[PDB]
Design a protein around this ligand. Structure first.
Ligand SMILES: O=P(O)(O)C(O)(Cn1ccnc1)P(=O)(O)O
Ligand SMILES: O=P(O)(O)C(O)(Cn1ccnc1)P(=O)(O)O
Ligand SMILES: C=C(C)CCOP(=O)(O)OP(=O)(O)O
Ligand SMILES: C=C(C)CCOP(=O)(O)OP(=O)(O)O
Ligand SMILES: [Mg+2]
Ligand SMILES: [Mg+2]
Ligand SMILES: [Mg+2]
Ligand SMILES: [Mg+2]
Ligand SMILES: [Mg+2]
Ligand SMILES: [Mg+2]
Lengths: 353, 358
């Protein structure tokens, strides 16, 4: 039903903008643009986050109560949209959900895309106000979105700068606008400790913690269960991001809906760390020389090393062991309702529905 | 006001401290602190601080004097509007291909930053506000009213920034979801060159976050009830002031000195619907309208020189001076209708320091 409800939350927000003191023709233009900004970026995904709000709420506890839950559910889908528009600018994305990235469109470009990230982000809080301002969890829901957003921003910053020169005794150069940085990996950062730090922040909080907490706050949970949920969410985000990093190398872009770019974008990935952990000293030198380069021969070397050190096999073994670790933590929850949803989510996570 | 200048470090370090509580390795926490301290210092400092100072003054002149704990909450809100200014200017300079901001290179231009960090940093600066309002005002009765004013002021600014950026775009003069290879050739839309459309843009991109938001912050914190009719009068004065302030800005883009303004002029080449463009279109001959269509929105010296020459020809400097004189009077007349001596002094004073600061 949540999928039918989409139009309702979008049109509620578009109606808010239509109340602005603008000339009728200008209101018509802004409606056309923003309807597309929402449809294009909120639709086409698995909707795992939104569906998770709906299920957690149902299994913790009418149409009026569903109107509030589906609002929160669509707000996380709007947050996903905001983060993916910004991520694709940052990661020089080509494709998103089998459509061109929003920032690439000649009618949009980076100039609109930056402004649109802020619009999508701010639409959430207007929608929570419209549907939940008189709820007791209202300020607690507002704070959950803000804290999970702040954590994602830090994660995105680490993902984007972990190998940067400013981090590899000297300070950021405020006088350099002409000498580009040559991306090189920092071997001191190639460890799972650093990787887990990035991954819990850029994915776990907004993808797992935020939807579960939304459903729980709305259903009325005040409680030490929230720390257990936080810990499961971290295990789940790590598991989900490792699979994503796997797909960037071994996935099919027609199936994933996006084009792989981590080797050329100098990302600290799970396949990188796993390879560094297993490979020979000359192969470490090969990685340093060829990683972080938007050049076919360079990415081919890295890709060949991922085949050589059987990264596909190590991932399969990781997934098996991490799913067990997640299930073991879920069993310690002592809440049958939440446990069913989380066990179910774990099964559909990579496929959706 | 002295409390404001000196308490910057306090709000900056309170937010930095919040991030230092994250589950991160000690060396990674040290790197995040170094980066974010600079993102705040570089983009929150160097301005007139008119918005922040306005919160401080409105609060002071609404109340009957104020303890340090009350000042801590006012200066928080004041610095939060300076952080909002920082977020909006960082994004604005990406959109407008800015070169200089407050006599320093724009943040997005730095090789250690770039657009990839700048976009993420706009979101950080924006979200830092709400964390700071929570830390210092969560137990206040105006708490929900303050965060709602920030988000509505921001939503209105985003719409104006969109109109400022797309008013002359082909999609407005259906959006093509299949075109990522055929660039749009920037052209002015003569049907949009009117003050009606101009006021719609400037009221949204400037008046709400620059005038309405800081006055309402000081008023909500001082305890004026959200149902009070004075808030609509303030909204109307803020619109008059926002329009007045933006027109002066457009004036400075052509006639200002970049060492004094701290920024390099670009509205002609960036194809903006400005006050000098509308005033010239209103006064000029049909062949001069053709000259504008042919030479505006072109990053080319000869093309910009034509537009500059037309602004000298139609005495835009003189028409601006006549506008400023008439708009200042209209603002003062609306201020006199407030029936609040405290707010009236602050707004009269603001109107004097608006272009200089202090
Ligand atoms: O690999 P990323 O972190 O950029 C990604 O997973 C998106 N993302 C953004 C934040 N967390 C995850 P995507 O591979 O979809 O481009
Ligand atoms: O001319 P803009 O509106 O882009 C500007 O005034 C910034 N701005 C952005 C919104 N309102 C004002 P700036 O000339 O400082 O680059
Ligand atoms: C956050 C990660 C790891 C990848 C993007 O999220 P999803 O894979 O949930 O994207 P959609 O289903 O929303 O397309
Ligand atoms: C919003 C407009 C019109 C120009 C930028 O604002 P300011 O001129 O107040 O900028 P700073 O004082 O903050 O540099
Ligand atoms: Mg990314
Ligand atoms: Mg990406
Ligand atoms: Mg990925
Ligand atoms: Mg600008
Ligand atoms: Mg601008
Ligand atoms: Mg300007």
């Amino acid at each position: 039903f949540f999928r039918n409800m989409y139009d309702k939350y979008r049109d509620a927000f578009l109606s808010h903008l239509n109340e602005y003191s603008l000339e009728e023709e200008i209101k018509e233009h802004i409606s056309k643009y923003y309807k597309l900004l929402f449809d294009y970026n909120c639709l086409g995904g698995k909707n795992n986050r939104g569906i998770l709000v709906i299920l957690i709420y149902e299994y913790v506890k009418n149409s009026s109560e569903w109107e509030k839950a589906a609002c929160l559910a669509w707000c996380i889908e709007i947050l996903q949209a905001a983060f993916l528009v910004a991520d694709d600018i940052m990661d020089k994305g080509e494709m998103r959900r089998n459509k061109y990235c929003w920032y690439l469109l000649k009618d949009v470009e980076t100039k609109n895309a930056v402004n649109d990230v802020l619009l999508l982000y701010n639409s959430i809080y207007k929608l929570i106000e419209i549907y939940l301002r008189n709820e007791s969890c209202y300020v607690d829901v507002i704070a959950t979105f803000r804290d999970a957003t702040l954590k994602t921003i830090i994660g995105q910053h680490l993902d984007t700068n972990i190998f940067s020169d400013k981090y590899s005794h000297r300070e950021i150069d405020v006088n350099n606008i002409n000498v580009p940085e040559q991306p090189v990996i920092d071997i001191n950062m190639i460890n799972f400790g650093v990787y887990k730090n990035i991954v819990i922040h850029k994915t776990a909080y907004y993808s797992f913690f935020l939807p579960i907490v939304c459903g729980m706050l709305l259903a009325g949970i005040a409680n030490l269960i929230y720390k257990k949920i936080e810990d499961i969410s971290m295990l789940m985000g790590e598991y989900f991001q490792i699979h994503d990093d796997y797909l960037d190398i071994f996935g099919d872009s027609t199936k994933t809906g996006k084009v792989g770019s981590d080797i050329q974008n100098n990302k600290l990935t799970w396949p990188l760390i796993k390879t560094f952990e297993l490979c020979s000293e000359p192969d470490k030198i090969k990685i340093v020389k060829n990683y972080g380069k938007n050049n076919l021969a360079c990415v081919k070397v890295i890709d060949s090393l991922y085949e050589q050190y059987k990264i596909r096999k190590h991932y399969e073994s990781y997934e098996k062991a991490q799913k067990a670790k997640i299930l073991s933590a879920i069993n310690e929850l002592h809440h049958e309702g939440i446990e069913y949803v989380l066990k179910y989510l774990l099964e559909i996570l990579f496929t959706g529905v």
